[PDB]
């Protein structure tokens, strides 16, 4: 069995959200 | 709580330490305080109403 070599022709950057701490609220 | 249903609770605020330390009579001379480390840590971690 032969091992293949793979490579993509197109690209699409990963788009992940960034979350920030919520406003202070007394416990 | 609220005035309609008050909920009394023991407390220890920042100004109590200030009052206690400053109320020492002046004639007796310089004083020194003794306290547990956790008490100082609790004192130093106070925050006002805005969180600062």
């Amino acid at each position: 069995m032969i091992k293949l070599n793979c490579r993509p022709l197109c690209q699409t950057p990963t788009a992940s959200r960034l979350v920030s701490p919520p406003c202070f609220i007394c416990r | 709580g609220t005035p309609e249903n008050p909920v009394q609770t023991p407390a220890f605020l920042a100004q109590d330490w200030r009052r206690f330390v400053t109320s020492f009579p002046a004639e007796y001379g310089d004083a020194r305080s003794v306290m547990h480390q956790n008490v100082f840590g609790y004192l130093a971690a106070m925050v006002d109403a805005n969180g600062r």
């Binding site: 069995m1 032969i2 091992k3 293949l4 070599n5 793979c6 490579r7 993509p8 022709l9 197109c10 | -």
Partner: protein
Amino acid sequence: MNFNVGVDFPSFIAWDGTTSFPVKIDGFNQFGFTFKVIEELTADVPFNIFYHEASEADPCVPGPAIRVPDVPFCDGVATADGLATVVIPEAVAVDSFCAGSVPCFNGPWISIAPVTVNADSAKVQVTVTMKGATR
């Protein structure tokens, strides 16, 4: 600037999704395969690799297909039945291509075809590229 690459590195079709064409590797001293999928697959599609020997009646007509034997590398597994195969994984996407080649030559013609002619086998295209003409 552009070059006539086809002068030095010609390529020939090997599988169309409905038929397979023997490719003459005799005059070229190196070669390799190339795979591409034109649609989403349903499962892996295994391909059988064959080679042909020169026919008796004519020096330029291929004979019946002969299955290529396996060749274990310096160390590692060997094919279950001692033959050579290639399997296209299901995770492959449409906008990508795969490359692979056999380690040895054997006969002067080579060919490749699917194990079974299913609906998925029509979605794959195989092309052969040759390098370094010797004659």
